[PDB]
Design an enzyme around this catalytic site. Structure first.
Site, PDB file in Angstrom:
ATOM      1  N   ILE A 158      54.140 -44.783 -20.206  1.00 16.38           N
ATOM      2  CA  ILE A 158      53.954 -44.601 -21.647  1.00 16.38           C
ATOM      3  C   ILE A 158      52.487 -44.674 -22.111  1.00 16.38           C
ATOM      4  CG2 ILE A 158      56.257 -45.348 -22.197  1.00 16.38           C
ATOM      5  CD1 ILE A 158      54.993 -48.127 -22.945  1.00 16.38           C
ATOM      6  N   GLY A 159      51.579 -45.018 -21.197  1.00 15.73           N
ATOM      7  CA  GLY A 159      50.155 -44.985 -21.479  1.00 15.73           C
ATOM      8  C   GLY A 159      49.320 -45.159 -20.222  1.00 15.73           C
ATOM      9  N   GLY A 178      45.219 -46.248 -20.373  1.00 14.17           N
ATOM     10  CA  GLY A 178      44.423 -47.425 -20.736  1.00 14.17           C
ATOM     11  C   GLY A 178      43.199 -47.591 -19.888  1.00 14.17           C
ATOM     12  N   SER A 179      42.409 -48.613 -20.213  1.00 14.52           N
ATOM     13  CA  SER A 179      41.141 -48.806 -19.523  1.00 14.52           C
ATOM     14  C   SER A 179      41.343 -49.069 -18.010  1.00 14.52           C
ATOM     15  CB  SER A 179      40.295 -49.866 -20.263  1.00 14.52           C
ATOM     16  OG  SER A 179      41.096 -51.032 -20.371  1.00 14.52           O
ATOM     17  N   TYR A 180      42.378 -49.822 -17.616  1.00 19.82           N
ATOM     18  CA  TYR A 180      42.720 -50.020 -16.215  1.00 19.82           C
ATOM     19  C   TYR A 180      44.250 -49.883 -16.017  1.00 19.82           C
ATOM     20  CZ  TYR A 180      37.976 -51.952 -15.817  1.00 19.82           C
ATOM     21  OH  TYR A 180      36.634 -52.118 -15.844  1.00 19.82           O
ATOM     22  N   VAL A 224      48.169 -48.566 -15.662  1.00 17.61           N
ATOM     23  CA  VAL A 224      49.056 -47.751 -16.472  1.00 17.61           C
ATOM     24  C   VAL A 224      50.030 -48.678 -17.165  1.00 17.61           C
ATOM     25  CG1 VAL A 224      48.872 -45.779 -14.874  1.00 17.61           C
ATOM     26  CG2 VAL A 224      50.829 -47.328 -14.688  1.00 17.61           C
ATOM     27  N   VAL A 225      50.680 -48.153 -18.194  1.00 16.90           N
ATOM     28  CA  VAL A 225      51.661 -48.887 -18.936  1.00 16.90           C
ATOM     29  C   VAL A 225      52.976 -48.160 -18.811  1.00 16.90           C
ATOM     30  CG1 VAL A 225      52.309 -49.846 -21.138  1.00 16.90           C
ATOM     31  CG2 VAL A 225      49.860 -49.494 -20.675  1.00 16.90           C
ATOM     32  N   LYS A 264      52.119 -53.455 -18.202  1.00 21.09           N
ATOM     33  CA  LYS A 264      50.882 -52.933 -17.622  1.00 21.09           C
ATOM     34  C   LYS A 264      50.915 -53.210 -16.128  1.00 21.09           C
ATOM     35  CE  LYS A 264      45.880 -53.543 -17.714  1.00 21.09           C
ATOM     36  NZ  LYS A 264      44.744 -54.063 -18.513  1.00 21.09           N
ATOM     37  N   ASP A 276      37.142 -51.731 -27.251  1.00 23.58           N
ATOM     38  CA  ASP A 276      37.821 -50.439 -27.113  1.00 23.58           C
ATOM     39  C   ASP A 276      38.736 -50.121 -28.296  1.00 23.58           C
ATOM     40  OD1 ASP A 276      38.137 -47.922 -25.865  1.00 23.58           O
ATOM     41  OD2 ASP A 276      39.541 -48.754 -24.353  1.00 23.58           O
TER      42      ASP A 276
END
Ligand SMILES: CC1(COc2ccc3c(c2)ncn3-c2ccc3cccc(N4CCC(N)CC4)c3n2)COC1
Length: 263
Positions: free
Chosen positions: A12-13, A15-17, A19-20, A35, A127
């Site tokens: 679903i995302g 991100g900076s590090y 995945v979600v 995450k 961020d």
């Protein structure tokens, strides 16, 4: 993919590090956001555990809650379970469907609360951007992704590294010479970029070439698109947030008293 009581579903995302992923929890019959991090991929530990430490001390309606961490030392993968915020990101940038001035104010009020809280807890987010602001079932936003956040001692973070999303980076963080810059101001600049995005559907400074983007952020005067027209008081607030000079840039206590914000 089963992990204790959780069944992992679709991504679903990013991100900076890592995945979600959506995760169903069989014990309480509801969904979470997980995450997922690779220890081997992060090497090419301690920065993660500092993010966990930060998340653990935070509890505010405009910040995404960490529920638990699943960290088997015999597995490469580390899992951070968060509350799921149903409706997801407030917007994708760019978009031809930007927010109205009234919707933007409502979310920007939540953003102010969240950021005011983070700064009080001595966290610089690093961020802030629309895609990190999640819309809850109650219509309110929650701030997500602490992957590049910093904790500081004393009244402000004194920072020298350049991280976050390039289009949202403050000009004082983009010098060729190593410089030191204050962290609260960086978050204010990114809030300004975000507010611009909210009402225009695009960033104020844009280029395919990273060096020219940096150049624009440092040296191009802020311009407003031809459409939509926005109110004079909102232009004023955006202009003061996007002040290239971090000394004269509006601070959060001033933002809270701004006429656009309080009308
Ligand atoms: C599937 C849909 C739902 O979207 C979502 C996405 C993330 C969601 C969510 C619902 N509830 C929570 N989180 C989280 C939670 C922790 C995060 C920790 C680090 C980074 C994240 N993000 C934030 C969003 C960004 N675009 C990608 C990275 C995180 N997100 C999209 O509309 C329904």
């Amino acid at each position: 993919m089963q992990l204790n009581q959780y069944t992992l579903k679709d991504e679903i995302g990013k991100g900076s590090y890592g995945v979600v992923k959506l995760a169903y929890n069989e014990n309480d019959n509801t969904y979470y956001a997980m995450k997922v991090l690779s220890k081997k991929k992060l090497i090419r530990i301690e920065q993660v555990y500092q993010e966990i430490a930060i998340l653990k001390k935070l509890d505010h309606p405009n910040v995404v809650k960490l529920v638990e961490v699943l960290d088997d030392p015999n597995e490469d993968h580390l899992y951070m379970v968060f509350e799921l915020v149903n409706q997801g990101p407030v917007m994708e940038v760019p978009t031809l469907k930007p927010l109205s001035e009234d919707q933007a104010r409502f979310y920007f009020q939540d953003l102010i609360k969240g950021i005011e809280y983070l700064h009080y807890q001595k966290i610089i987010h690093r961020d802030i951007k629309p895609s990190n602001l999640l819309v809850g079932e109650d219509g309110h936003i929650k701030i997500a992704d602490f992957g590049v956040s910093n904790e500081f001692k004393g009244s402000d973070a004194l920072l020298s590294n350049t991280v976050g999303t390039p289009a949202f980076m403050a000009p004082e963080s983009l010098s060729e010479t190593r410089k030191i810059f204050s962290g609260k101001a960086l978050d204010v600049w990114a809030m300004g970029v975000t507010l611009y995005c909210f009402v225009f559907g695009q960033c104020p400074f844009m280029d395919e070439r990273i060096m020219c983007l940096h150049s624009k952020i440092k040296s191009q005067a802020l311009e407003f698109p031809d459409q939509p027209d926005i109110a004079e008081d909102l232009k004023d607030l955006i202009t003061r947030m996007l002040d290239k000079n971090p000394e004269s840039r509006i601070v959060v206590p001033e933002i809270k008293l701004h006429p656009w914000v309080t009308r």
